[PDB]
Every structure is written in structure tokens, then in C-alpha cells.
Design a protein around this ligand. Structure first.
Ligand SMILES: CC(C)CN(C[C@@H](O)[C@H](Cc1ccccc1)NC(=O)O[C@H]1CO[C@H]2OCC[C@H]21)S(=O)(=O)c1ccc(C(N)=O)cc1
Lengths: 99, 99
């Protein structure tokens, strides 16, 4: 669709068998999800933002369904205050910024 | 313009007489710039980023030139990893996200 930015661009996603709301975020290189269970091996990272850094687990090749579209990519899991869909998945949707 | 998301959507802005690089950030409610000096009075504000809450200076009705367009609105100034243009100004650009 065409999503305006008058409000937060929040969409419903399905990941790890769980349904949740997440923010379409052009300012995020990668997708970052609030603490949840995911299968497989992971690697520790530190990612930085406005309040400083948060410790996350990096999972690779995680399928996520976003607005009825199945995409796959890197997901970072940790104590983020909100679920963020980053550029690494938005590209798979063919999502662009337009003005 | 149409901006794909394979790379960071960075643009040059002109603000307070200076040129700066800034990130078009749909995950940001607000526009947040690194320490700067802007005219007029400021008001206290606390914002919550990925790492926690941060004190910033809120300046109102600041003109910024972005991609050839003049926007005028609220600018928060404080410790940020990068200058971010949030939805408050992107709406003035007429920015939308599209599939
Ligand atoms: C600040 C930018 C440069 C990076 N951040 C993405 C932003 O869009 C970040 C996303 C977000 C984090 C926490 C709560 C709500 C939204 N937004 C963000 O910090 O916005 C600030 C300014 O306006 C306010 O509205 C929402 C929170 C406040 S990030 O910190 O969340 C981030 C950092 C690293 C990565 C990564 N390494 O992939 C991904 C995301």
C-alpha cells in the first residue's frame, strides 16, 4: 500500500509463531524485536541508539510475515522498548520512501 | 523522488546556517540533531530511544532545508549517534512508505 507518516507506521507481523505489532523503520539497519524465543544459533552484539547501547542476540535467516508477505532475514532480539522492522526486511517487501 | 532502502536514506540538510548529514527515519516521532546552537528559547524534553531516556533541548519553529524543500518545525537537540529527521518533518515533505 501507501502508508502515510501522520501516525507511526505500525504493521502486524508473524514471527516465531507469534503475532505482534512492529514499526516500519527506515532509520534501522536491521530488524530488532522485543525479547522472545527463536530457534537456532545466535551471536552476541551491542547496538547503539539514542539512549546508548543494548545487548542483543543476532539470529540469521528468520522468516517473518509482514502484511501478508513472507520475507527472510537477520533479526536482532533484546530489550528494545518496541518491535522495529529495519531496512534489511523492508527491502524484501519492495518498500521505498517517496515524496 | 523515490528512495530505496538497500542503503541508509541519508540526506544533506541546511539548519541554523550549517550543512549536516541526516537520516530519514520513519521510526522517529521527532527530529533529533547532535549539539548545534539554534536561535530562540528552548524547553526541556525527555525522549526514549532504544537504550533508554535522554534529556534534550526542544526548539520550536526551526526552518530546515531538505532535498530542496523548506520545512519549519520542532527540532530536539541532544546526544544522538546520528542526526535523524523524524515524522514531524517528513510529513511536511509529503513522505510516504510504499510497496
Ligand atoms: C536512532 C537511529 C539512528 C537508530 N534507531 C532507529 C530509530 O528509528 C529509533 C527506533 C525506536 C527506538 C526506540 C523506541 C521507538 C523507536 N527511533 C528513535 O530513537 O526515535 C526517537 C526520536 O523520536 C522518538 O520517537 C520514537 C523514539 C524517539 S535504533 O536505535 O532503534 C536502532 C539502532 C541500531 C539498529 C541496528 N544496528 O540495526 C537498529 C535500530
Amino acid at each position: 500500500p501507501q502508508i502515510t507518516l501522520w501516525q507511526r507506521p505500525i504493521v502486524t507481523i508473524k514471527v516465531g509463531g507469534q503475532l505482534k505489532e512492529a514499526l516500519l523503520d527506515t532509520g534501522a539497519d536491521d530488524t530488532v524485536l522485543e525479547d522472545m524465543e527463536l530457534p537456532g544459533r545466535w551471536k552476541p552484539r551491542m547496538i547503539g541508539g539514542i539512549g546508548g547501547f543494548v545487548k542483543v542476540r543476532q539470529y540469521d535467516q528468520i522468516p517473518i510475515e509482514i502484511c501478508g508477505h513472507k520475507v527472510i532475514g537477520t533479526v536482532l532480539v533484546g530489550p528494545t522498548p518496541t518491535n522495529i522492522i529495519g531496512r534489511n526486511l523492508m527491502t524484501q517487501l519492495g518498500c521505498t520512501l517517496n515524496f
